[PDB]
């Protein structure tokens, strides 16, 4: 993010980080279940990448994390690589994450409901604070 602030650590129970195996964070994601996850499709997630949860910093010599192995990528049928419409993906995990004070799940909308303009929402992540 550009122009954010340090959230409260574990302030966001649901936030994951996505590492490849050069052990590097490439994309964000959200925990729906103990078993399941949601991310973006343009992220090019494979069975070979990792989900990290209940983390804070990446400098950690070690934090009390959860390095979780992927099972099956559930890509979206409709991801359009020029459009970027239907930019979604799902992750089933070899193992579940255990819900603590820090790790937990985001609630879901329905296609029925309205989240009207002018509404104050939030966004989190380890993206660039400066371009």
């Amino acid at each position: 993010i550009v122009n954010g602030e340090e959230a409260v650590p574990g302030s966001w129970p649901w936030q994951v980080s996505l590492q490849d195996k050069t052990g590097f964070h490439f994309c964000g994601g959200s925990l729906i279940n103990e078993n399941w996850v949601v991310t973006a499709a343009h992220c090019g997630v494979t069975t070979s990448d990792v989900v990290v949860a209940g983390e804070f910093d990446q400098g950690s010599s070690s934090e009390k994390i959860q390095k979780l192995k992927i099972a099956k990528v559930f890509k979206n049928s409709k991801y359009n690589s020029l459009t970027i419409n239907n930019d979604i993906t799902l992750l089933k995990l070899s193992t579940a994450a255990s819900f603590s004070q820090t790790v937990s799940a985001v609630c879901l909308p329905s296609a029925s409901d309205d989240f009207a303009a002018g509404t104050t929402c939030v966004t989190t992540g380890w993206g660039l604070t400066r371009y």
């Binding site: 993010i1 550009v2 964000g28 910093d57 879901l108 929402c121 989190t124 371009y131």
Partner: protein
């Protein structure tokens, strides 16, 4: 580097697709959602990231971080994949595995 080791938070407005075409036009789909242009933007490293809004107090996943200004400029709205338009498959997916 412009890399945060620690997790960054941000807070922002929701835009009408009508309001968002003012910037993007032809590019907005029935399937996206715009937010920000209020002096913030997701940048690189953020994509796949959440977008939440509080409802009956519980925090709901409104949108996913897609794409945006070439420069992550703070005057430009960020585009997010609209969850509203994607859930039934999520629910249909988790319905089977």
């Amino acid at each position: 580097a412009n890399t945060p080791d620690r997790l960054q938070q941000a807070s922002l407005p929701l835009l009408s697709n009508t309001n968002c075409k003012k910037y993007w036009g032809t590019k907005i789909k029935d399937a996206m959602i715009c937010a920000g242009a209020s002096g913030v933007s997701s940048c690189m490293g953020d994509s796949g990231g959440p977008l939440v809004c509080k409802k009956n107090g519980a925090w709901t996943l409104v949108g996913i971080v897609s794409w945006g200004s070439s420069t992550c400029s703070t005057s430009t709205p960020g585009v997010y994949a609209r969850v509203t338009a994607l859930v039934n498959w999520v629910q249909q997916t988790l319905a089977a595995n």
